[PDB]
């Protein structure tokens, strides 16, 4: 499936099985743009987080319960949700994916 292949390709499960990961299907500029949208607090209680005004196409990759390295296994869940990212630097760009509502 897409998750098993994309997680491998992106060097995410080549040396371990990453529990969860989200892939956004929007242009890189459109996601970078979220850093100047709705400001919200991050889970940890920080405030360099931003929620997108709109929902975006995303694919959630969840490791099955029986998954174990080297045989990593993922449950693929496609969806449209508002993304929340943590921004930092100059230019001000996303460095962390906080969540999808």
């Amino acid at each position: 499936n897409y998750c098993n292949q994309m997680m491998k390709s992106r060097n995410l499960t080549k040396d371990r099985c990453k529990p969860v990961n989200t892939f956004v299907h929007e242009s890189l500029a459109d996601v970078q743009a979220v850093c100047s949208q709705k400001n919200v607090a991050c889970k940890n209680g920080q405030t360099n987080c931003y929620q997108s005004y709109s929902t975006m196409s995303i694919t959630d990759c969840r490791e099955t319960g029986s998954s174990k390295y080297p045989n990593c296994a993922y449950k693929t869940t496609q969806a449209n949700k508002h993304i929340i990212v943590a921004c930092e630097g100059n230019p001000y760009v996303p460095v962390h994916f906080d969540a999808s509502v």
Binding site: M6, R10, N11, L12, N21, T22, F23, V24, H25, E26, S27, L28, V31, T59, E88, G89, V93, P94, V95, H96, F97
Partner: peptide, 15 residues
């Protein structure tokens, strides 16, 4: 090495 913004891209971007 790979910056935090570059890592975000390799890990979450699939335009």
């Amino acid at each position: 090495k790979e910056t935090a913004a570059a890592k975000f891209e390799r890990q979450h971007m699939d335009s």
